[PDB]
Design a protein around this ligand. Structure first.
Ligand code: 34G
Length: 129
């Protein structure tokens, strides 16, 4: 599923991301834009053998099991395929654990490099939320 901007903002808000760990909703929408271009089915293979899955490109070395990431953990206790669903619940629940790992949303390098310090509220303006 390719979410619309405002559609995804609404779904993230219903699942509790607005101001989660202090990050306003626009930060989450911006991160999804530059991680996945709002495409729940996005995957990207890393040179180290791990794979990033879904709307927030969550990585298999620590956070989900895909059965092909040597030496990995599964700290969100989910199959990585669950992060590709049109229902974003599993991605949101796992993202909540990630943003708690001490680096906040710097855990998403695309957030740090492309969203951090910008007018992220522009991502939710004009959205019914
Ligand atoms: C309501 C307008 C969209 C919302 N903004 C949020 C702020 C923002 C920040 C960006 O980088 C930090 C950014 O980079 C790509 C985009 C945005 C936008 C996205 C807006 C515009 C919109 N995106 C989908 C379709 C489209 C097509 C466009 O031209 C064909 C266009 O021209 C300006 C804008 C957009």
């Amino acid at each position: 599923k390719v979410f619309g901007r405002c559609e995804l903002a609404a779904a993230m808000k219903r699942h509790g991301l607005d101001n989660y760990r202090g990050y306003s909703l626009g930060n989450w929408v911006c991160a999804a834009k530059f991680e996945s271009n709002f495409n729940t089915q996005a995957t990207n293979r890393n040179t180290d053998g791990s794979t990033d899955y879904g709307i927030l490109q969550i990585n298999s070395r620590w956070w989900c099991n895909d059965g092909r990431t040597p030496g990995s953990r599964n700290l969100c206790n989910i199959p990585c395929s669950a992060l590709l669903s049109s229902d974003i619940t599993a991605s949101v629940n796992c993202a909540k654990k990630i943003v708690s790992d001490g680096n906040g949303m710097n855990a998403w390098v695309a957030w740090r490099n492309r969203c951090k310090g910008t007018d992220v509220q522009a991502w939710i303006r004009g959205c019914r939320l």
